Design a binder for this molecule. Structure first.
Ligand code: NAG
Lengths: 121, 49, 42, 49, 110
């Protein structure tokens, strides 16, 4: 089946890394624009970037450059989301949804990662 | 020429209207249009007064 | 007087993209639009 | 950047070269190119591709 | 970047056009417009893309349209499941960014 699963709820502190596995199946992985999209709690969707598993080509966002880490593993056809250093305000949901080049829309969305990060443990 | 349409302009007063006056007037490229079309005819139609 | 307005273009019949250099209202429309084919324009 | 599965059918090309193309030119006009010297009147004519 | 009405109200059985009003580079530039159904408590689901195409599972009562610099999502016969949130989004060439998302349109059933 075509499904993009996520990781469970996590509570932690800024500074450390959070690794997310978004496995892809049912489509040619090295032929579709896979990417991550973030949404603040109670706000709109804001675009982070889309990565191409063929060449790890990433186009980030003005307002989200130097804040997050993205990658992918074509060996296991899984999308990787990573953080070099979190923030207290970074408590928000992050969705890994696959788009297509030309007409530039996500045809399918992953479940999304509900992550709560704050200064307190 | 080379796909870049060219327009030149040099407005000069002339008292005579029957016979075209002599003299040399060299025009200037006021704009260099990159129209990228073919042009194979033209005309000039004014307004009504 | 004044030479009012000016109309150019290949054919205005969509066989080519057209061309137009009218002068009006302290502006010069140099748009290449396929304007109306009319023998009595303004 | 242009990975459209099934083909992005928005990118075009003039398959039938009617004549030689002048450098930097650009032609935007759709008309059947007759190959049998017949009045196309659309696409109904023979060899009007 | 894409402005939208914060709250749109619609009675059952009524047809309302969700106005996707945009700039001259997102909608008015001739670029295509896509919609996602942000169902509350879940992830958005694709509802309209291409201004005329409907993906599998989308009922024909859902519809989309484009009007010059603005786009409209025509929904006919509002039901209980239609209480959902919609983001129209398109592509922006000038901002370099592949993806630009709308401000959003909260839809409530009266
Ligand atoms: C422009 O039109 C003339 C007459 O049809 C034609 O001979 C010439 O090749 C054309 N140039 C192009 C290729 O646009």
């Amino acid at each position: 089946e075509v499904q993009l699963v996520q990781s469970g709820a996590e509570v932690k502190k800024p500074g450390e890394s959070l690794k997310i596995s978004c496995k892809g199946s049912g489509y040619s992985f090295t032929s579709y624009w896979i990417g991550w999209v973030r949404q603040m709690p109670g706000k709109g969707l804001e675009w982070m970037g889309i990565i191409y598993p063929g060449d790890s080509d990433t186009r980030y966002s003005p307002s989200f450059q130097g804040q997050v880490t993205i990658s992918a593993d074509k060996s296991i056809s899984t999308a990787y989301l990573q953080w070099s250093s979190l923030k207290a305000s970074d408590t928000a949901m992050y969705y890994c949804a696959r788009g297509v080049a030309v007409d530039w829309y996500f045809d399918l969305w992953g479940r999304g990662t509900l992550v709560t990060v704050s200064s307190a443990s | 020429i080379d796909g870049y349409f060219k327009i030149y302009s040099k407005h000069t007063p002339i008292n005579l209207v029957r016979d075209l006056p002599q003299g040399f007037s060299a025009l200037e490229p006021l704009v260099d249009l990159p129209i990228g079309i073919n042009i194979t005819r033209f005309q000039t139609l004014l307004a009504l007064h | 007087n004044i030479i009012r307005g000016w109309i150019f273009g290949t054919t205005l019949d969509s066989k080519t993209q057209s061309l137009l250099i009218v002068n009006n209202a302290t502006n010069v429309v140099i748009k290449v639009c396929e304007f109306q084919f009319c023998n009595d324009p303004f | 950047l242009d990975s459209k599965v099934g083909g992005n059918y928005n990118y075009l090309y003039r398959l039938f070269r009617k004549s030689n193309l002048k450098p930097f030119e650009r032609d935007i006009s759709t008309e059947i190119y007759q190959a049998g010297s017949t009045p196309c009147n659309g696409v109904e004519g023979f060899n009007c591709y | 970047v894409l402005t939208q009405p914060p709250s749109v109200s619609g009675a059952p059985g009524q047809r309302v056009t969700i106005s996707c009003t945009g700039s001259s580079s997102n909608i008015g530039a001739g670029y295509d417009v896509h919609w996602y159904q942000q169902l509350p408590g879940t992830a958005p689901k694709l509802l309209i893309y291409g201004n005329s195409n409907r993906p599998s599972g989308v009922p024909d009562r859902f519809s989309g349209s484009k009007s010059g610099t603005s786009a409209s999502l025509a929904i006919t016969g509002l039901q209980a499941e239609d209480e959902a949130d919609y983001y129209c989004q398109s592509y922006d060439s000038s901002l370099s960014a592949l993806y630009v998302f709308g401000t959003g349109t909260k839809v409530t059933v009266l």
